[PDB]
């Protein structure tokens, strides 16, 4: 209930909201059906439009006008944004040359440069180039400020998850806004775009920037705008707030445009109808910048122009129907469209089986335009699992397609655009420009992820960020000043360096190897290798630091070095360098099933071959590949029991092709590579390293835990004219986190040779180094020549494999 008979007089776009039944005058009151009776009359004036004209200059103030051209308007803070251009001979901001903003040039009383976030819905990254002729204000912000070629959104690439990620620095799984539509089974409640459940605070986790600011004594303008407030009025409201007294004036503001998304859905991303929305957005930027210039704020404010996601060509004829695969289609609930999420229609149906739904959806049609996953099997880079609002069964839909339950859902076309697909898809990428005293001048930065921006907005305002998924410091290169200078994390566990401590006969592991094959030149030599003489070649960036409490050993070899876990009975990491000139060899026939005890590591902290023999599902692989041994004698090291890891036969196909073919391919293409590989245990799919008590599967009969995934980090010189092991400058990296699965059901062409499917699999499971850090508790690149912030940027890089 709302007692709508209060008044909005002197309360228009008030910044503190009032409690029901008292009526509201804030920028969300329309969205709550709570505005006072006179809110339209007083707060949404439109009389005489939005621009001063020659005949209005010096007029007598008429409070009915939408904005003013009278002499007092500047000190009142309510002039039309073009007032000084029409009435005082000034130039539009867009017509002024770019001039470096070295320091904030702010009116007295400003304690910090304000931040204005200019957010645009569905603003696809390529609009910056393809629309540049019709967006002169945006183009000047871009060329004169700091810009990225694109900014990566989060998955799903929809509005609500992405705006809230922008606001919090959190993945959707952590902030809780996992879609535009959700069912929370603990609440037993549904969140939808229409309706009122979405206003309940219980959906919205983390700490968004406006709360962060308020808690630390920095005032914030309200970020949300009811859809019927026109853009001109949003801009004028911000500019009016910027004229508040010092004690009342916010330091952080957001504008939001529903365009170009709205028109994109109707017309496709490049429909000829798209030029006009782009022009109109540009005009709105121009109104802000002119208005800031009038207030002497154009060289004071930091402005961020940022999108939530892009837009793809999608029509209703490109819909896949679950009714074509499932016999039981009425026993499921589908969240449909550019992704799918499936759960049982009724929790009383004991016949509902996810395994049989997955199987009925797996590789059933030759051109099938979606792929089912149990959520824990989705690519780890999507970080899309650890939330009860994310259904166990997921469908990753191909770009340009939809999925629906039944044909009647789609005809009971309108639309030519949509979005929501995998966040590496080129059409889903969006934009970032920063312009202001605190951003760099005329500077292009590499693409980055939108989860990073919260930290930077905090830096811009002198705020300590709440705990988030950004890597704070990774975007320091965007900033002229207010950089954040973190210290590397301290190592928690120091390694042991075991020497030869065990005789061969102390091992009863059921392993065999044909290696009784016998010199002081080459005996001193092999001793030096075991003591670390080649470690500078294979460990190029220092050993990784272990950031949690555990017991592990460093093991040196000619060809590779490893950090061996006494708790998990395998390496945490294995590091090796393969030059451009390295040669690939086969496993000799006599060594095919060779596994050799490691005389540095106790039988009690070793794996055993008998467990693998007994476990009919599980085989083994090696982390340092025998194929890349530097010599026949060095090859014996590769068969140590301490280089062995549990592998499903199905996975061995993948891993063998990576090791035998791809590593050498990358070393040829990149002029040598350094490789760090290892196991990952994430049984609770939270993106973080499991403790021992979280492990759900062991090699039958043993204490050997089975990884959920295998990683590799592949580093070389960014200047590929220099070999990876003699690189003077910046590094280049690509990484993956491969799911350790007992079948290759994910890969529909897996019956073909590995050359036709393995690399496509690996591309899908591309990863950042930081993703592997979360998953292992390890900290990489500890000893380079490079600045730490540069290394943090390196750690957030994702190799996406999309074209330009």
Ligand X SMILES: *[C@@H]1O[C@H](CO)[C@@H](O[C@@H]2O[C@H](CO)[C@@H](O[C@@H]3O[C@H](CO[C@H]4O[C@H](CO)[C@@H](O)[C@H](O[C@H]5O[C@H](CO)[C@@H](O)[C@H](O)[C@@H]5O[C@H]5O[C@H](CO)[C@@H](O)[C@H](O)[C@@H]5O)[C@@H]4O)[C@@H](O)[C@H](O[C@H]4O[C@H](CO)[C@@H](O)[C@H](O)[C@@H]4O[C@H]4O[C@H](CO)[C@@H](O)[C@H](O)[C@@H]4O)[C@@H]3O)[C@H](O)[C@H]2NC(C)=O)[C@H](O)[C@H]1NC(C)=O
Ligand Y SMILES: Cc1nnn(Cc2cc(C(F)(F)F)ccc2CCC(=O)N2CCC(CC[S@@](=O)c3ncc(S(N)(=O)=O)s3)CC2)n1
Query: CB under 5 to 8 A by kind: which of ligand X, ligand Y, Na ion, none does 750 bind?
Result: Na ion
Residue 682 makes contact with Ca ion by CB under 5 A = yes
Beta bridge mates, 734: 714
Tally of CA atoms within 13 A in the half-sphere of 655 that contains its CB: 30
Stretch that binds Na ion, among 108-116, 222-230, 409-417, 743-751 (CB under 5 A): 743-751
Rounded CA separation 452/789 (Å): 13
Measure CA 235 to chain center. Answer: 30
Among 420, 430, 483, residue whose Cα is nearest residue 455? 483
Contact 317, 400 (CB under 8 A): no
Judge whether 386 is annotated as a binding position. no
- What percent helix, strand, coil does the chain show, rounded to 5? 30, 20, 50
Among 500, 516, 482, 742, residue whose Cα is nearest residue 619? 742
- Out of 34, 159, 471, 608, name the contact with Ca ion by CB under 5 A: 159
Judge whether 201 is annotated as a binding position. no
Among 127, 38, 44, 149, residue whose Cα is nearest residue 804? 149
Which residues have C-beta within 8 Å of that of residue 210, sequence separation ≥ 6? 167, 220, 222, 223, 252
Which residues have C-beta within 8 Å of that of residue 630, sequence separation ≥ 6? 558, 559, 582
User: Inter-axis angle of helices 275-294 and 136-144, to 10 degrees?
Assistant: 60
Judge whether 72 is annotated as a binding position. no
Give the residue closest to ligand X by C-beta. 205
Query: CB under 5 to 8 A by kind: which of ligand X, ligand Y, Zn ion, none does 471 bind?
Result: none
Burial of 351 (0-12, 13-18, 19+ CB in 10 A): exposed
Query: CB under 5 to 8 A by kind: which of Na ion, Zn ion, Cl ion, none does 180 bind?
Result: Cl ion
Instruction: State the nearest-atom distance from the C-beta of 433 to ligand Y, in Å.
Output: 13
Residue 651 makes contact with K ion by CB under 5 A = no
Residue 383 makes contact with ligand X by CB under 6 A = yes
Judge whether 682 is annotated as a binding position. yes
Residue 185 makes contact with ligand X by CB under 6 A = no
Q: Mark 113-128 as b/e (b = at least 16 C-beta within 10 Å).
A: bbbbbbbbbbbbbbbb
Question: Which CB sits closer to ligand Y, 219 or 580?
Answer: 219
Question: Which CB sits closer to ligand X, 233 or 389?
Answer: 389
Question: Which CB sits closer to Cl ion, 180 or 315?
Answer: 180
Instruction: State the nearest-atom distance from the C-beta of 309 to Zn ion, in Å.
Output: 7
Residue 612 makes contact with K ion by CB under 5 A = yes
- Out of 407, 467, 632, 649, name the contact with ligand X by CB under 6 A: 467
Instruction: State the nearest-atom distance from the C-beta of 594 to K ion, in Å.
Output: 16
Query: CB under 5 to 8 A by kind: which of ligand X, Na ion, Zn ion, none does 626 bind?
Result: none
Reading the block at residue 254, the tokens are 């957001």
Residue 387 makes contact with Na ion by CB under 5 A = no
Residue 173 makes contact with Ca ion by CB under 5 A = no
Of 81, 159, 776, 800, the active-site residue reads: 159
Binding mask 679-718 for ligand X (x = CB under 6 A): -------xxx------------------------------
Judge whether 779 is annotated as a binding position. no
Binding site residues, ligand Y, CB under 6 A? 117, 119, 121-122, 158-160, 163-164, 166-167, 180, 193, 223-225, 254, 256, 258, 261
Rounded CA separation 115/477 (Å): 18
**Residues near Zn ion (CB under 5 A), total:** 1
Residues 231-290 that bind Zn ion (CB under 5 A): 261
Rounded alpha-carbon distances, angstroms, from residue 567 to 491, 577, 626, 679:
18, 27, 25, 13
Rounded CA separation 23/1 (Å): 10
Reading the block at residue 381, the tokens are 């880079």
DSSP string, 526-582: HHHHHTTTTHHHH-TT-PPEE-S---EEEEE-SS-EEEEETTTTEEEEEEEEE-TT-
Question: Which CB sits closer to Ca ion, 121 or 398?
Answer: 121
Rounded CA separation 225/236 (Å): 13
- Out of 82, 174, 263, 474, name the contact with ligand X by CB under 6 A: 174
Question: Which CB sits closer to Zn ion, 261 or 398?
Answer: 261
Judge whether 553 is annotated as a binding position. no
159 is catalytic: yes
Rounded CA separation 617/621 (Å): 14
Among 335, 255, 307, residue whose Cα is nearest residue 428? 307
Judge whether 159 is annotated as a binding position. yes
Stretch that binds ligand X, among 462-470, 479-487, 554-562, 580-588 (CB under 6 A): 462-470
Contact set with ligand X (CB under 6 A): 170-171, 173-176, 205-206, 383, 386-387, 467-469, 686-688, 774
Contact set with Na ion (CB under 5 A): 744, 747, 750
Binding-site residue set? 121, 159, 180, 261, 265, 308-309, 419, 682, 684, 686, 688, 690
Binding-site residue set for Zn(2+)? 121, 159, 261, 265, 308-309, 419
- As annotated, the active-site residues are 159
């Amino acid at each position: 209930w709302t007692a709508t008979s209060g008044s909005c007089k002197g309360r228009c776009f008030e910044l503190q909201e009032v409690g029901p039944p008292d009526c509201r005058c804030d920028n969300l009151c329309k969205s709550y059906s709570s505005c006072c009776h006179d809110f339209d009359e007083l707060c949404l004036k439109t009389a005489r439009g939005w621009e001063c004209t020659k005949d209005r200059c010096g007029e007598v103030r008429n409070e009915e006008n939408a904005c003013h051209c009278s002499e007092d308007c500047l000190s009142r803070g309510d002039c039309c944004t073009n007032y000084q251009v029409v009435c005082k001979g000034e130039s539009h901001w867009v017509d002024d040359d770019c001039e470096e903003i070295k320091v904030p040039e702010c009116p007295a009383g400003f304690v910090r440069p304000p931040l204005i976030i200019f957010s645009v819905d569905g603003f696809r990254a390529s609009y910056m180039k393809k629309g540049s002729k019709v967006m002169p204000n945006i183009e000047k912000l871009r060329s004169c400020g700091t810009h990225a070629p694109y900014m990566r959104p989060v998955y799903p690439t929809k509005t609500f998850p992405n705006l809230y990620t922008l606001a919090t620095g959190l993945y959707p799984e952590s902030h809780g806004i996992v879609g535009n539509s959700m069912y929370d089974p603990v609440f037993d409640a549904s969140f939808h775009l229409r309706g009122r459940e979405k206003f309940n605070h219980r959906w919205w986790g983390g700490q968004p920037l406006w709360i962060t600011a308020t808690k630390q004594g920095v005032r914030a303008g309200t970020f949300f705008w009811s859809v019927s407030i026109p853009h001109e009025r949003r801009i004028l409201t911000i500019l009016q707030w910027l004229s508040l007294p010092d004690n009342e004036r916010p330091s952080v503001y957001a504008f939001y445009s529903e365009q170009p998304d709205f028109s994109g859905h109707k017309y496709g991303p490049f429909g000829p109808e798209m030029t006009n929305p782009l022009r109109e957005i540009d005009k709105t930027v121009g109104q802000l910048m002119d208005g800031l210039k009038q207030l002497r704020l154009h060289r004071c404010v930091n402005v961020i122009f940022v999108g939530d996601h892009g837009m793809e060509d999608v029509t209703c004829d490109r819909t896949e129907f679950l009714s074509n695969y499932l016999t039981n289609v009425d026993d499921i609930t589908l969240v449909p469209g550019t992704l799918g999420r499936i759960r049982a229609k009724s929790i009383n149906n004991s016949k509902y089986d996810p395994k049989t739904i997955i199987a009925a959806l797996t590789c059933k049609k030759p051109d099938q335009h979606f792929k089912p996953y149990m959520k824990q099997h989705l690519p780890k880079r999507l970080h899309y699992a650890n939330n009860r609002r994310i259904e166990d069964i997921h469908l990753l839909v191909d770009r340009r397609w939809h999925v629906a339950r039944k044909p009647l859902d789609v005809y009971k076309c309108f639309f030519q655009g949509d979005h929501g697909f995998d966040n590496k898809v080129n059409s889903m990428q969006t934009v970032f420009v920063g312009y202001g005293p605190t951003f760099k001048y005329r500077t292009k930065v590499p693409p980055f992820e939108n989860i990073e921006l919260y930290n930077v907005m905090c830096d811009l305002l002198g705020l300590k960020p709440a705990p988030n998924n950004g890597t704070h410091g990774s975007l320091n290169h965007l900033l002229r000043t207010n950089t954040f200078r973190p210290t590397m994390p301290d190592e928690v566990s120091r390694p042991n360096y075991p020497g030869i401590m065990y005789l061969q006969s102390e091992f009863d592991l059921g392993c065999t190897c044909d290696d009784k094959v016998e010199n002081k030149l080459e005996e001193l030599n092999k001793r030096l290798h075991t003591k670390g003489s080649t470690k500078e070649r294979h460990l190029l960036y220092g050993r990784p630091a272990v950031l949690y409490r555990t017991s592990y050993d460093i093991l040196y070899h000619t060809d590779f070095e490893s950090g061996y876990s006494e708790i998990f009975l395998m390496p945490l990491w294995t590091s090796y360098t393969i030059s451009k000139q390295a040669e690939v060899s086969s496993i000799p026939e006599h060594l095919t099933n060779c596994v050799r005890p490691d005389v540095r590591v106790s039988p009690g902290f070793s794996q055993n071959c008998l467990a693998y023999k007994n476990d009919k599902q599980m085989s083994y692989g090696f982390l340092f590949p025998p194929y890349l041994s530097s010599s026949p004698e060095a090859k014996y090291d590769a068969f140590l029991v301490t280089n062995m890891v549990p592998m499903y036969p199905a996975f061995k196909r993948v891993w063998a092709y990576f090791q035998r073919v791809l590593v050498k391919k990358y070393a040829s293409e990149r002029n040598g590579v350094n490789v760090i590989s290892g196991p990952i245990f994430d049984y609770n799919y939270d993106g973080l390293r499991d403790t021992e008590d979280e492990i759900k599967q062991y090699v039958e009969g043993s204490s050997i835990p089975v990884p959920t995934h295998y990683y590799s980090i592949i580093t070389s010189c960014l200047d590929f004219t220099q070999p990876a092991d003699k690189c003077d400058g910046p590094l280049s990296v690509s990484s993956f986190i491969l799911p350790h699965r007992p079948d290759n059901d994910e890969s529909c062409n897996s019956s073909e040779d590995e050359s036709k499917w393995v690399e496509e699999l690996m591309k899908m499971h591309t990863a950042r180094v930081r993703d592997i850090e979360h998953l292992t508790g390890l900290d990489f690149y500890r000893k380079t020549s490079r600045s730490y912030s540069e290394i943090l940027t390196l750690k957030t890089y994702l190799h996406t494999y999309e074209s330009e």
